Design a protein around this ligand. Structure first.
Ligand SMILES: Nc1ncnc2c1ncn2[C@@H]1O[C@H](CSCC[C@H](N)C(=O)O)[C@@H](O)[C@H]1O
Ligand SMILES: Nc1ncnc2c1ncn2[C@@H]1O[C@H](CSCC[C@H](N)C(=O)O)[C@@H](O)[C@H]1O
Ligand SMILES: CCCCCC(=O)Nc1c2sscc-2[nH]c1=O
Ligand SMILES: CCCCCC(=O)Nc1c2sscc-2[nH]c1=O
Ligand SMILES: [Cl-]
Ligand code: NA
Lengths: 341, 341
């Protein structure tokens, strides 16, 4: 029963996603809100007949997103609640971004990406993903809130699983809207921070730093990590960034980080560390699905320890040590330092 | 908090999981790997992919439980993966290919429009109702026949242990496909005689299966239209995964044909999803609400409650005598239907 059931689960994933994508697109979590909503009331809220919306809501209830309390009356589960825009841990923008054509249409050509080793995004939309997003403000803002949604799991745990006490300054290279650094600064009140981001993402970081009340302890600057990373910090973070890039580009980024570490600086690579032998993984987001997403969108990849250490060696760096996060997060903390010779 | 988030992440990334499985099926990787351990460099030549590209796909497949990486670059199938072999007696290869084909997936890209209109999106995308289309496309017809065999194996294996066929001399399967259900029944009950009633194109697939099974001397194949009639004279009639293909008016017509054929001493066994009044999660290998939405987008059919089916029986001069369960992993029930007083 189990062997067949698992294959049936894998094969019918795309249809499950379309049900979830409809819930997010129709903003049904917000329409339902806290309490019990009548399907006839919800139908008028998003120009659908009652019968059709009832069948979608029955499906969402079967997939664990809603509960049918009485016939035609639905409430959100804890899972459905996370699609509310107003949820403190909202994954709404995460759901919209990963069900948007910009992240899904490149997967229709997964085969061609595997054959070429190059992303399919470019041919579908006319440019590399980051140039496209720099030119599409709505999607760039969606992207920033999506990486926030994903990073909450890591942000909530990183302080318990890494010792930040020895450091006075920390720079987050590709630090997004500052979700990671603000969590770290809130738990370490003597610590000062910098976010280094693209022009477009840095404006999101500025308003997050203000809203977090960290204006006096966290600087926000824009620049290009293919140029020089600003020097003199004791700790540099780089989270969910190296996996966006091929090996030649990762060497250039690590090279820029090496100049910035100088003598005393340490680099903390926050990313999936793939095992040498691939097996099922308890992480909330599958690391091998992450690998193939990075391929189709950006021409990046997830890496083993040995693989990343090889790229470190080309940048004049070495892996000191790899620290785990709780099994559900699926990211590790790779401590990287300059190579004596 | 943790569980609620994890389940939502599982639902959102189903479409990417399905693209990895679709790639495995399309590239015939299950066959290329076979019984043993296969090296990625050998498999790379068997499907015209570079080694790195294929290795990443196989590592994703290992992550999703479809195979195992015993040594770096060396892969074996799991129980789950082995069901995608064409040589497997319980193969779901054709089922996998059918449900990842444009003909079943493109209608899901307009799920919303189907919910709004209550009409299938298939017709707009391909130019005719699904059964018309398949009558005029022999390759998709043959794939469909093999697909339903794959689905029906779970019902076929269990139906004898959960229903007493001993009281009956003759059994007619109304829309019985390639004969998978009735050949399972006849193999377990040596004194039983059977008839498969199907469209002219599918009946050729059924006659092929019946001859290959050595059952020609107690299994006949008859073709026609169950809107016109069902072949009379049989003790037990079966109609499996068929009523859910049609709207209420069409179901009533099918059930009127069955009624005529039942006469006095005939009995009908409707084998289909029985939806509860309140939608909740289900341990079935195939989600019945996703079945509901597949029926909508492909055919404008639907899954139905007991009470709904009972009033459709009433309009045909039939009543539900009782409902019998199958093991929870199957997700279908056996509804006994008899002439009304
Ligand atoms: N050339 C470049 N210079 C600086 N930042 C860049 C860059 N190209 C991409 N980025 C940034 O790299 C980030 C990668 S996504 C990771 C964001 C954040 N660290 C998190 O884990 O949530 C994006 O925020 C993007 O804006
Ligand atoms: N007008 C018609 N007359 C008879 N059979 C029909 C029909 N229209 C469709 N069918 C058949 O009804 C079946 C529905 S699919 C179910 C097939 C089989 N009972 C199984 O469970 O595996 C198809 O095989 C299709 O060919
Ligand atoms: C199961 C797959 C989950 C994938 C999550 C994902 O894609 N993260 C992501 C993206 S999308 S564009 C740039 C980035 N950087 C990232 O870290
Ligand atoms: C996750 C649910 C998928 C259900 C599979 C499905 O729809 N089977 C099916 C089809 S496809 S065309 C005609 C039919 N008749 C059926 O019983
Ligand atoms: Cl200030
Ligand atoms: Na700095």
């Amino acid at each position: 029963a189990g062997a067949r059931s698992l294959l049936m689960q894998r094969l019918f994933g795309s249809r499950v996603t379309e049900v979830l994508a409809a819930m997010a697109r129709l903003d049904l979590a917000d329409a339902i809100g806290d309490g019990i909503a009548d399907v006839h009331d919800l139908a008028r809220s998003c120009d659908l007949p009652a019968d059709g919306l009832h069948r979608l809501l029955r499906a969402l209830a079967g997939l664990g997103m809603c509960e049918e309390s009485e016939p035609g009356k639905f409430a959100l589960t804890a899972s459905g609640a996370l699609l509310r825009k107003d949820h403190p841990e909202s994954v709404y923008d995460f759901a919209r971004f990963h069900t948007a054509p910009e992240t899904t249409r490149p997967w229709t050509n997964l085969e061609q990406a595997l054959r070429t080793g190059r992303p399919t995004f470019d041919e579908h939309f006319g440019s590399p993903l980051y140039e496209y997003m720099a030119g599409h403000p709505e999607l760039s803002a969606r992207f920033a809130a999506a990486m926030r949604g994903e990073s909450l799991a890591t942000a909530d745990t990183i302080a318990e699983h890494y010792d930040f006490s020895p450091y006075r300054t920390v720079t987050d290279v590709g630090g997004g809207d500052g979700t990671l650094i603000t969590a770290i600064l809130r738990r370490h009140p003597d610590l000062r921070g910098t976010i280094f981001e693209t022009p477009e993402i840095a404006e999101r970081a500025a308003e997050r730093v203000r809203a977090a009340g960290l204006h006096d302890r966290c600087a926000v600057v824009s620049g290009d990590f293919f140029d020089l990373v600003p020097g003199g910090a004791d700790l540099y973070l780089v989270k969910s960034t190296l996996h966006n890039w091929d090996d030649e580009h990762v060497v250039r980024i690590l090279s820029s980080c090496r100049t910035a570490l100088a003598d005393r600086g340490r680099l903390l690579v926050i990313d999936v560390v793939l095992p040498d032998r691939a097996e099922p993984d308890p992480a909330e987001l599958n690391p091998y699905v992450k690998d193939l997403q990075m391929l189709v969108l950006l021409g990046g990849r997830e890496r083993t320890r040995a693989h990343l250490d090889r790229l470190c060696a080309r940048a004049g760096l070495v892996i000191d040590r790899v620290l785990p996060l709780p099994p559900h997060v699926g990211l590790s903390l790779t401590e990287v330092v300059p190579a004596p010779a």
